[PDB]
Symmetry: D2
Amino acid sequence: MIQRTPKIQVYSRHPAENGKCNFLNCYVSGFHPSDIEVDLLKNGERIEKVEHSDLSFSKDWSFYLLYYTEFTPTEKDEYACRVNHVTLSQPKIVKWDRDM
Amino acid sequence: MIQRTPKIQVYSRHPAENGKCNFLNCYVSGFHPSDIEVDLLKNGERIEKVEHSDLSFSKDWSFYLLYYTEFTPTEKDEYACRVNHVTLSQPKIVKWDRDM
Amino acid sequence: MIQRTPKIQVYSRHPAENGKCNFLNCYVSGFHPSDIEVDLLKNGERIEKVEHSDLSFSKDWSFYLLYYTEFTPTEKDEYACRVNHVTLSQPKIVKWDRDM
Amino acid sequence: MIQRTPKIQVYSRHPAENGKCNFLNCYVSGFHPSDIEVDLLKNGERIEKVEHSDLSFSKDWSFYLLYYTEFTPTEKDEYACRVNHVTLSQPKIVKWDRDM
Ligand code: NA
Ligand code: NA
């Protein structure tokens, strides 16, 4: 099928509270082809190697992937999701907005 | 990920009986990349009615697909599954064996 | 959780055409508890073969079950679905309407 | 279908480390009927009200459910899963073993 650029959404499972265990999610959706490089960053640095969830699926040849890690939010730490695909000229970085 | 040739299996859901409504299946498994051409054939012509399940994937990026159609078997008619992929030099035809 | 009466829908997978192999379905939805008796009838007589899907439930504990069989529709034959549950006083019979 | 007692398994998603955000799972499997009361305890007291995962399913009228919460393991704290079902005379408590 024809190439399609992924939509990237970065969010925490529950409202962020410093010192309270949570899980950070990077949902990459509606893309084609499947070959994708997804990394979760903590202060511009990759945390642990995590692959797509079992909840991840395919619909009308397009791909819908979810990557998640458990984390304790802190005041000075900055979180982001780095995504690289054939449809992108350079790797895209989507920052995590605590207020969203 | 690296290229992987599909395993092709052609079978009817229930033991074949002439004049008795059944379901013909073509199960293509353990392949990479996802782009695949799958068509169910009846003698000369291609069955232009064939449906498919959703494209399912493993953690190791191997794809699984099931193509199916409702059919009434008959002693004279010959059924087959034509599969084309990047790993194949020419389209592979797997005939349906009523006895297996 | 509290008792909930099932919604019964009887339909063929594709629009009915005499002599053309199809699937007759009986979709029992939004019920509680899970224990249910579902039978497909051909001219008031119960079809022996009858297959069923896996039991599916919502986060709120309502059940969704699908009962199906391969069939060839004919002009002279009448189809129905007999459903029995704790919420029903007597078994409910839902006739198959070809035009619905 | 006939009554079947659940098999209860309590485990953390990753090897336990004090002060490191994790997931505490309680997998209740192969039970019938569906009506079940599952609570995760911290020193004999319930945590936040947790519903079953979307990975939860049904197989041959039996039920397979997964309940999970965030949590940060600490040295003093004891974790357990309290399960109540019709097949049990009194609520069963399965303690979390860090080494299992
Ligand atoms: Na903001
Ligand atoms: Na009508």
